[PDB]
Amino acid sequence: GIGQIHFNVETSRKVCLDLAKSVLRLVPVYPLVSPVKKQHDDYWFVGRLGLD
Amino acid sequence: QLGQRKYPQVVMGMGMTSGFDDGYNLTPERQVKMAYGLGYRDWWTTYIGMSHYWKGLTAF
């Protein structure tokens, strides 16, 4: 009663894959970085009176 | 409503000494009125807390 308007689950899956490649071309590397770099075992847990 | 005992006592002419590390949990209103009712009227000496008054922070 309507027709063929919407993509298949497989065809839409291919569209999403193309979208991923397009974004990766613009951004080839992860742009964010956390303040910490090492594992949890490489940092002491200490308390201080404050910065000053 | 819950029943409660409240019997004021005669003043013995003595003060009260307390510590902050042992009274942080209780509200100040309950502590002062309770001690005053027992008969401690003239003096009060409070020992500051050992690890509950200063500022501080934790860091890696």
TrEMBL record, chain A:
It comes from the Viruses. This is Gp64. It comes from Enterobacteria phage N4. The lineage of its organism: Viruses, Duplodnaviria, Heunggongvirae, Uroviricota, Caudoviricetes. The chain holds residues 54 to 105 of 417 of the full protein.
